[PDB]
Structures are given as structure tokens and as C-alpha cells.
């Protein structure tokens, strides 16, 4: 998520082993490293052009997307740089030949390359453990604008 400033805390935040030689002056002035995650997913222009940092970004950081790729609706954005994803499914109870509606919340990491509101459907990829509960990293946000084009009813 980030939210403004970039150079905002006690330590200088830089991409490790990326050097921006302060003698021969470049076009970008500071070199930005990125990679494409693969699996058919696309690295956004917000990630390449941006000034944000993140070690835990799947594009500009050090984590690698591998294993399971899940999808679900966003429940909570409140905690910084991460998210909560609800993941509705049907559990088959065999005795009654019917289905229970079930739940399971997946906490996931949000790269500051994304604008995520509560209720957006999000594609999330598995990676190396990031915190106590997080194993997943947001790859694609599917709800793009909602109705930000024509919000007002007047023709």
C-alpha cells in the first residue's frame, strides 16, 4: 500500500544490491529493478514507474510466486501494506447429499502497485512466508473502477 512519502522511517529504504552510480548521470537518475512474475501474469506500469520500495512485492521485491494461485473478494484493507481475502466455497456433507456454505479468510500482501478497496475481487499467489499468517501476495485486482466512469445519474 505505502501511502505517500517513500523515505518515511528510521532506515533508508532501497532495493538491495541495486546501484545508482552518482558520477555518470542517468535518465531515470535512480535505477529501478523489477521482474515479471510469470504464469501469464503482467507486471503493472505502476510498479515500474513508481517510487515506492517493498521487499515483499512480487514485482519489485525479493519474494517469488510459486505453488497455489487463489481468487476471492476483499474483506479488509485496514492493516498497512496487507489485506484480508474472503474465499466462499461449498462443503459437501455426504449423509444429507447437500452443501454447507463455508468461509476461510486468507490474509495476503498488497504491493503499493495496486489500488484495493473492500469488495474488489483479487487474484493472489502463494509465496515464501512473509509474516505470522501471510503466505500470499496480491497479483491482480479484478474490480478495476466499479462505477467510477458514470457515478452520477444525470444524462
Amino acid at each position: 500500500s505505502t501511502e505517500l512519502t517513500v523515505q518515511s522511517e528510521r532506515a533508508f529504504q532501497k532495493q538491495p544490491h541495486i546501484f545508482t552510480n552518482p558520477k555518470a548521470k542517468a535518465n531515470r537518475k535512480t535505477k529501478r529493478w523489477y521482474k515479471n512474475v510469470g504464469l501469464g501474469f503482467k507486471t503493472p506500469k505502476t510498479a515500474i514507474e513508481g517510487s515506492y520500495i517493498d521487499k515483499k512485492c512480487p514485482f519489485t521485491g525479493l519474494v517469488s510466486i510459486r505453488g497455489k494461485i487463489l481468487t476471492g473478494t476483499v474483506v479488509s484493507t485496514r492493516m498497512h501494506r496487507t489485506i484480508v481475502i474472503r474465499r466462499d466455497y461449498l462443503h459437501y456433507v455426504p449423509k444429507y447429499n447437500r452443501y454447507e456454505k463455508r468461509h476461510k479468510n486468507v490474509p495476503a500482501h498488497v504491493s503499493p502497485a495496486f489500488r484495493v478497496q473492500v469488495g474488489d475481487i483479487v487474484t493472489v499467489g502463494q509465496c515464501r512466508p512473509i509474516s505470522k499468517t501471510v503466505r500470499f501476495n496480491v497479483l491482480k485486482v479484478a474490480s478495476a473502477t466499479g462505477k467510477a466512469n458514470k457515478q452520477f445519474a444525470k444524462f
Partner: protein, 150 residues
């Protein structure tokens, strides 16, 4: 079979088979549209306008002649109200009840009725939010409701 009473009635208008304009009716769709617009300007709700059309003029149904429903037409011209008509009416009704209650307190039947009305309004509100006719946060209370009414 009704929504808040034990009532079971089936009284309703029965729309005819033919979508096409009735053979006896002349005029023009444009004319009809103009009339509708005029009515809207004057300050009438869709239903009222429709009724007027049915009665004073040769209009059976607006969709039969023009190709569009009255509300749609209103919207197109930029005349459809801030609150949908039915909802507004409901709100007004609720307000009246509230006013009555304010005056006389021991009317328990009235109070009961008010609750029903409120519930109905809430239902309608929910529907509207889902359809996004109302702004998706619009709530109904008391003072606010009164303000809306007036």
C-alpha cells in the same frame, strides 16, 4: 398474497396482448413524448402522468405508442426525481404516521402500523441500493426523513 396483512386479493390491471398501437389511435409518438415532458415540468409523478394519458387522451400505455416507459422518458430528458416515486410516497406516509404519533401517544395500533411502513421502506431502500438508483449509503431515519418529504 400481500406483504404485511393477512389479505389475499388478486385485483390488478390486465395488459392486452398487442404491443402495437391501437388501430383507432392517431396522433404521434413525438406528441405523446412532448405531453409527458410537459406533465413532468408541471410537477407530476410517472403514475399520475400515465393515468392522465389514459384518461384525457388516447394513450393506452406509453410503451405501446412511444416505445419507452414513462420513467425512462423522464430520465432521458433529465426529470426523474432524487428519490424514486414509490419510495418517496412510502416515506411521506411514514412521516404522517410519525406526526400523528407525536400528537397522540396511546395509539398502539398506529405505532404498529408505523413499524410495518418503516420495514417496507427499508426493504425498498435495500432494493434501490442494489440497483444503485439511490447513492450507496442512503439511509432513512426521522428528522432526515421529514426533510426529504418536505
Amino acid at each position: 398474497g400481500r406483504m404485511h396483512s393477512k389479505g389475499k386479493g388478486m385485483s390488478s390491471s390486465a395488459i392486452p396482448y398487442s404491443r402495437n398501437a391501437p388501430a383507432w389511435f392517431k396522433g404521434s409518438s413525438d406528441g405523446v413524448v412532448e405531453q409527458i415532458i410537459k406533465y413532468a415540468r408541471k410537477g407530476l409523478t410517472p403514475s399520475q402522468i400515465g393515468v392522465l394519458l389514459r384518461d384525457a387522451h388516447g394513450v393506452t400505455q406509453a410503451k405501446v405508442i412511444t416505445g419507452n416507459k414513462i420513467l425512462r422518458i423522464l430520465k432521458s430528458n433529465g426529470l426523474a426525481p432524487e428519490i424514486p416515486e414509490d419510495l418517496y410516497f412510502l416515506i411521506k406516509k411514514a412521516v404522517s404516521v410519525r406526526k400523528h404519533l407525536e400528537r397522540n401517544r396511546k395509539d398502539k395500533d398506529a405505532k404498529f402500523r408505523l413499524i410495518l411502513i418503516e420495514s417496507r421502506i427499508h426493504r425498498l431502500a435495500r432494493y434501490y441500493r442494489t440497483v444503485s438508483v439511490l447513492p450507496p449509503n442512503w439511509k432513512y431515519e426521522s428528522a432526515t426523513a421529514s426533510a426529504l418529504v418536505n
